Amino acid sequence: NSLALSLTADQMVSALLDAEPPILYSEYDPTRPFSEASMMGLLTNLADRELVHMINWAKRVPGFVDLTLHDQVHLLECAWLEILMIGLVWRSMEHPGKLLFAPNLLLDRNQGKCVEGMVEIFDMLLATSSRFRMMNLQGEEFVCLKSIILLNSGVYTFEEKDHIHRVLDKITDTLIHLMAKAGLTLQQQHQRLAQLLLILSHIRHMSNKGMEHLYSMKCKNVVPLSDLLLEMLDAHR
Amino acid sequence: NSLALSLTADQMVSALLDAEPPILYSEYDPTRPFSEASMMGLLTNLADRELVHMINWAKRVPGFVDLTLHDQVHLLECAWLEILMIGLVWRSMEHPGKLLFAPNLLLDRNQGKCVEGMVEIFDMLLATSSRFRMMNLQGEEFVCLKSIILLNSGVYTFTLKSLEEKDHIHRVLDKITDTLIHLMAKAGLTLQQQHQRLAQLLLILSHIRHMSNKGMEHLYSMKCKNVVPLSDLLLEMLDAHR
Amino acid sequence: HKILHRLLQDS
């Protein structure tokens, strides 16, 4: 029925690697001392442009096209902030103590104090980056985790449900195939699988706490939010 | 030095099973079709009494005593609602379309609409229960998942010496992972089926985290609404999440 | 009418 289940492990990895969105740049202004309104403007503008690439990255995820239009909308509405965060965390691996929102926008926890309530989200994001760096997370594992977020985070807020779970099982087979490829023993394979999937619980937590902060930003009306971001934000009520 | 690292998989299961807290009763009266503010009073009273058993249950979890006191406080302050919810979901497996808060308090989603915003959290709990039902979740797997939630939900929210105890928590987590795999291999599942089922169970915990997050936000509104009597312990747990 | 509807159908 669906061609995603017929792909092999390497073909699954290649399709996810080739689908990777590009690393966008922040607005050029050197700008570096920041205020609440200026930092929120740079991140909001960056997040709005990353969403356009994420939506096109989602259609390239094997099995995502097979869902109905409403099912695709629901999965992206619930996962979009998680996907932004895990990408930011992955970009910040090689920069301990820093968050790489863009190649020209590297911030630390001191700059998170400019925005009211963001320093808490910053520390959790930095902690996830240290966790990935301590685990030596590979890019093949990262694209698997990110697609798991897209398919799993909304599967329980809905025949069609068995499709997503079978695609989720495919990625699980792909993750194990990557770990057996790197020489990990059987005990190390299911242990590392568990460690990686448990971090998704914390990424969900960071997203929920992030949604609250972005909701108060709409009520503060300090920075005008784009209509696309407003629709993704109103989906969480 | 820890006993949790010396235990075997079967020894891990029996230790967690022997530590299971009891199923508590509510003060629900079927003769009184009471209102929504009263139903939350029953759930608030029930959750408050369950917290006392959960606190003593946590001491029985292997490795939890080897942690410092303030780390035990942090772990429970962030996981307590998740543990209440997965326990509620587990008790409700054999009651499709209903949530068994207590043996005398069985509610469907129609009676959850009485409280504002309560209907959404009810549906997520029901979907989680039906998810456990189609997976045929076993009791030995439930106690592992519940103990994983306790150790994992606050491990990233914790200077140089404090990260040594953080390493001890990941050791116990890997041991519980070995226990889950041992159970699935005992049930006649292939290596492919073990890794899939292990992944399916751990992906539930992110949804349980989501339910707890939305649950915390609903509890915060009740405190400011000042309509349901919240106990001093629940108000202290609620102030831990700000 | 959702903007997300339009973006998922375009390329």
Added chain:
Amino acid sequence: KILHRLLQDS
């Protein structure tokens, strides 16, 4: 703290 207390009671 009540949680600190119940964890500490022996």
